[model samples]
Target: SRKTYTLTDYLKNTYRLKLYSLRWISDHEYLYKQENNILVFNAEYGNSSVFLENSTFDEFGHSINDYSISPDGQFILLEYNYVKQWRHSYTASYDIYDLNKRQLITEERIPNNTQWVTWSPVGHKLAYVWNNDIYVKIEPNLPSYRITWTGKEDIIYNGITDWVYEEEVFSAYSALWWSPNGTFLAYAQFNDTEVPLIEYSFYSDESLQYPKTVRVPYPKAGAVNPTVKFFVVNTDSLSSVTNATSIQITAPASMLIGDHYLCDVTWATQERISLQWLRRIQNYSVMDICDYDESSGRWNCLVARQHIEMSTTGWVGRFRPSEPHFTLDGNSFYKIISNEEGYRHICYFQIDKKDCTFITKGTWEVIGIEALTSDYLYYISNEYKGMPGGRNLYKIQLSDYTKVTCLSCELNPERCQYYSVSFSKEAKYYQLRCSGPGLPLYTLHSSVNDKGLRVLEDNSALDKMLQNVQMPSKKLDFIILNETKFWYQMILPPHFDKSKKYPLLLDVYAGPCSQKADTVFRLNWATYLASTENIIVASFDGRGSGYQGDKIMHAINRRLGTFEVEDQIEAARQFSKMGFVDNKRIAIWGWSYGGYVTSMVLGSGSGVFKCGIAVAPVSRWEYYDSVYTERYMGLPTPEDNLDHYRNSTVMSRAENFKQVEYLLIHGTADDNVHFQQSAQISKALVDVGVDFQAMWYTDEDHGIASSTAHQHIYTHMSHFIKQCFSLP
Candidate 1:
């Protein structure tokens, strides 16, 4: 009774699948949610038990939406009634339930649009940000104390981030940090008094007469930014408001000389704090280390600092330097940066030393640090072979640093080329997540024995389901330009034929540190176009693409829309020479930065692409955020680097777009890559009398993924592409 599964069935389970929420509790046990019940699974015994049940919350008047187990494993903080404010900010009502007693202990109603709620790492003490202010509770129902009172509407925010800081700088909701011992708390205060405000309309079902207007304090390029300050508070003194003390950690004098950004913060120890700062142009970054000076009886003092400058060849540290990973003893830190080979590698820096040591060196980049121990460093790297997108786990000895071994390469190379690892706290065991070039697989493995590896999930159901479906074949290869190899991926039609001509669509996202041609497998619109529509979908990781090295990645640094746009044009020309592509019927499309590239490419007057689509594309650098735009294009002012900005903007080349078919898409409520980007482009095109297609998703954000909007947008684009190719 086997029947073919249609698109309806595929849509139901392709992106949406029933999977457990898994978290490692200890080396031997892990917690997962099976329906509304929390269960603990033991690996050694191969048994499971109910840690908590939804029945336990029947009398609490609200069901748990999400939860976290406290460090001591005695309490579970249940989150309910969650309302999202922005990408990383949300508010939720919380209730603490005792796991031992299986009953609700206490509940608290957090403030509207509370951005963050977190439990201290060492204890059950919790801290939260409400209405931009910080609040703390020593224990359940023991008189909560407010640590900050300077938070004002559209002016300043304390303990939580303002819009720009959350969107660009930190990429996190909370601006607060808890010391390891939970004895002290550090938070950043943002004063946005001088930044401009962006106002938008909010139309609701209840407000039929008139829409409500919402305003956000936002700073564009060459505008006044928020003045940021970091402060540390002694949690032990919270009981007495009069005696409570706080210390303001001073910013580096060089960083404060002009507009700056507080990038990140880390507690090296209870007595030591480290923070990162960047100038507006982002050409230089300063790392400051603060420690308690007991001799002076000062709360905090600047101990040491270092200045990191970007090379003329590129931006600093792969889009942004990742947070420093501290050594086991916290005396030193390791970070990935460009080495002599122009590739990113692990480098070690000590607190006392003025310099850093290059720990690893090669042409290939280390993807990320996975696990770190006193004696070994476990990381994901593509250096196993020359394939930049292929990932595998590697272990390096931290002592003599002589030995380097591939942990997962030899196990099942064919099925597990693209890998990700989730290490246990002590690095004793790790969950190896194998993603495709094949059906995905998941397994748990121990450091001591490869034979003891346990199969956690193999996606056997997905494998079985895909058996009856005709999948489009993916072809991975590279195109050489001036002896430099640039990688690309082509999703060929089902049962592809090399001799048959097919209309090609260049799928792109060629932003800085962005890699579109990777080995990770997924089902998406590209697959559908290739399988059902017989259109060839391809992507090229050209000049600004990452993982290859800094040289290639930074080739277009000061020339954002130049080489990147030229590379796509060149890739299209080269792909056309493959003999099966219809050169006259080619089109290109992208979103966000990719959308910017799509517009730039079409407007280049290359004649390689006949049509293109740009969704949420930035038309001008001045309209974008400071941190990201300045990293590549530098300052927008004439005194700094104005010509590069003017030449690279898509709006400046609007007249060139008249030669090609263009479609501009945007969401009216996009927070990141705001609607103004596309709006500006549309205005420029209109002023030049250049006709093009346009679509605006009302009330949708940058992703345009709310409700049925995703499906509708894709459907609209599918028809647009079909019309361009005349395939239907």
Candidate 2:
């Protein structure tokens, strides 16, 4: 702890770049880093003077959380984490500062525990969300005024989201929005008491004397969803001492949860906001632009765009996820993702009175989209303007969508992703990170000076490291199925010969929050297998794989096993096309949600995949936790619909596993996703006289992450897969 840590001190690793958390001051020309809990702006990277040092610590002598910054780079704010129910408790408190004086503005809590604090357009005010309300600090010298009062823990919330909305929707702060002019604030209110209550129990494992039920409101599949209402609150200008006055924009349902589910709400202008709405049953979806008048307190629906579903023949129409739209102008915006005509693509939404037009027509699915500007729209698609298996970033001007600009070169294969993007004031500077084959994560920083075409953070070190590690990783081919493409990475055996067939291991995390496809310079299981076992490994981003945004991530909602099963099956079919893969010796494997999908693939999909290994799988949704399952499935509804859940149960399909080999593994004390799931499936397999291997870890939780124990478990898995394929 007393060692002098420099920015270049531990430059041992290959991916060497200055820590991004350490921001540079342009005005003062000082490089700053936090040294000994103080904001030290240094003449150099690591050596500096204590610019500011004022903090408080917890009981164990550790600062919880603190520090804030102004928008124009002239001020700083500080707050600390509060001890609450969960270990990850957050709060709003302490002081903010003016960098010029380096003094505290106020030493008070901002009305409530505010986690995500945002400085107003002009850094003079701070807006944040608490319990359910949105509050704004008018004068940084004093406390805040509650901007929206139509919020409560058990009833309604404004600016902030509910548990399900935050967890499943988007984990972003300030559900409330401030207009560019700072005159009006628009926010959402969730009223979900209609949902069912699911309870959990925690016992003192030390004594096993008693258990206590932790009651929580959770909605499972096919059950009632909480009602969400979007509202606009107008700030009172005629009040003394910056008083808070809440105004209802309408009768709530006029622009909110009436007969439809609110998917996304964003403001494009002070007078208009966009809302993505779908039916409660999820049978159809629509995008609506609504107009709001702050003075008259009225809401009017402006434009609505509807999606037409394909008629079910022998194939099913699975709803793909779409990213949130960014308005280019008041009359037009970009729906960067959609599945209107059987495939996904980046399209321009040209507003016509109360109607919209879809531009950028193509047969390819738009994998990713980053609206760098109204002129240059960035996207990732397999319609590789040049080579096959090569995905590149392309820019097309909105004025004429026909003219395509290849931002990247043709010969040098590239896979450009929609990593985080930052837009500067006056729409000048745009920054993006692109990761591809043999490329470590690197940022491409550009400004209007270079027309958003020049690179600022070229990240030379990462580029070199990627070039060096090129031998181990292959440029994963993007394969399309039923209108959607699955990005995948494959690592062939060290001594692989194209003529000889090799056993294929489908290493996967089919869960909705993973990127198992990219060949980024990160330590992963594929590296372990390729380096040690001489085994070929492949991984893909299946249907439920996340971060493509709301719609695609929620594709598995209600029908968990169905779409995911199809994706894995389709992945295997794609792999079979490759010459090196022995289709008959293919095996799928994963842990937790990955484990859940592995089991489903084996049961629901065709026997193309020869074997499977599921580690800590959920046998049924009803057996899972209240919070997680309810977010996706809602709740168990009709007694007849019980068959749907039954069909989804991996345990019931245990008897159908005589055709493929399997190895089931679980930890005994997995309170999170109890070992009960594994145990039930084992029972079903044994009762049905199916042959398979099973291993149970005693007193271990979900991950079975104990280092020594994990090594032993992996050794056993390695042996099982090798034996199944008759490999060394």
Candidate 3:
């Protein structure tokens, strides 16, 4: 059953395109534009699709690309543009339509060429932010009266977010949530005036005479961070201060808090605004539900706070859920997964109690958790008892922890999901998507009633391909390196016999803040290497690797190479001891973070891993981005944490290297992790009189341009590996 569909067809058939943000409103009813340095909007919601019509570009601007609809669905907002910037386009104008009059409502000049627009939920009025300041459009029904200003600059922000908060902490839009009654808007005001600024250059040889200095306010490791404060803006009074009557009805908890870093904020009721309190420096995090009292101008603490702590040094690994999900109830909870209590499971805290509770009592890690119902918890647990590489979905009632049932029974290296869950008025009824590697994921629509099941989508092409695919599956085993847990999956060659020794291709990604081992997963590349090349390929999770708790994860902080390298070198020694692996022919390779580890294994004088390949590795943290590096190692200077950088840097230790064949690869335009790392390593290897091969992709960035170029990288790598092993 070979079935196929275009990318566009796949997208359209799978999901519905509805109005998620303001784009839905604009393209459906009205439009806006900036003319002569003024803003304008049409009045109507839905007539002739004015928003869509204005979005047109070709045939003298008849094609529309974006828009927003009025609250009552009476007016259409239209926008269009034809300007292109680096990597993305940001040129457009907006307009509004008057449905009743069948004409444009109002006209004036407004700032054009920006994305993200939304109308007020109550109708008649609208609020928008551009370049950090808040502007409102009101009901003289005229365009001129609409642009009321609220706040802007480094001084203050209204209805918007600063660059760092938007990019790192929150999503694109950083506006406050409008209360259900539409009388008040609860929002967070970010005072990032203290965050450090890191600068880089944007240039081209064809036209640029000077390098464009782009300054990004990045909070690097051990650097000054943004200070945040929450506020409720009164639209009626056009002020942020809430009145006394409004505060009296508020929850008691919001009034006590005078100052704190307000990260995640939500409004449960018109009077109660819940704010998450993250410590100013952010080494530790917690959430507190606060009641804002408008009458007395005070804040009160409503519920108990949940504290999420890291390691001894107060460094939490990037292995955390950035966004916390709140239940249907107003109380939001914090959950952390850790193996400290034997196997990995969830630890949670109730909104009323500051104390935490380990929710799932098990000897295995609860890899994933999804809410199936208001009271039922569905999760994929790694507790296979004696079985390895097995993950079964178990559902339990949150109330009494009763009724544990296995939803899935298949035991294989694949991640499966229940794609769709349809519900009637009382949450009854059907459908699920189940899939595995080399197994075409098909849909099964089943209900509680007489109808057994109905088939929706079965990828026949994938089934056909799997029929012809000749890769062998792997046998996974969890290995313990002293106290650290490292899971290694082994895929033996097709001709492999347990009695015969084989050269091993050690595939590793000992990246900081990254986890490579998962019970429910296998990779296409590993399968190809094992079955096609007749070589043993295995992947081991070293220290500093993810999926474990914060304690085990943070141990590598500021000291990346020592712990991870020791664990990996021990894994190699254990492999050699097994009698089936060749110690002399053992080879290792990795890209990015893996590449960094590969460099370390070769230079660290470990001697266990013979040959190495490091592609686009971070030779040193100093050459890396300020945000990612500083978060872990602090700042890079001779005065502070210089030894941390020196230890992890591969190029710095190249002089100590001996008896290791190497291949280094890098792209010139890599802005994330610099090509300077590769160049420095090449210089070191050359100066040390080491023979190695170097491959450079011209003008390519971190992602290496395209798939074809990526294939070239592997082809070169395969040839290098074969040469190092002296294989045919």
Which stretch of 10 consecutive residues in model 2 shows the poorest summed lDDT?
308-317
Ranking by lDDT: 1, 2, 3
Candidate 1: deviation at residue 722, Å?
0.8
lDDT tens digits, residue span 188-215, model 2: 7777778665544555356777776544
Collision count of model 1: 0
Highest-lDDT candidate: 1
The model with the greater TM-score, 2 or 3, is 2
Candidate 1 vs 2: which has more TM-score: 1
Cα displacement (Å) at residue 647, model 3:
2.9
Deviation in Å, model 2, residue 330 alpha carbon:
2.0
Q: Kindly list the per-residue Cα lDDT of model 3 for residues 1-728, writing each as its tens digit.
A: 22222222222332222111111122212122322111222212112223333323335344556555666656656666635322321345666666565665556423575433556565645555555554555541544222224454544555556554554445444455676556665555566667666555556465778767555455554556555545555555543232212222232233234222445665655555555554433355555566557675656764445345544443542532233444555564534445454345656555666656676765455666654456665666555443323445566667766466655544222444222122222223333334332342333222233132434345555445444444456666787777745777777765468787878878778766565554432334455566556668777777776545455566677677778877777788888888788777889888888888888888877778778788888887766644456556756677767777776778767765667778889877665566777988888878888787789876566677455567777777777777777778
Alpha carbon lDDT of each predicted model: 0.81, 0.59, 0.56
lDDT at 534, model 3: 61
| Error in Å for residue 454 of model 1 | 1.0
Residue 65 lDDT in candidate 2: 57
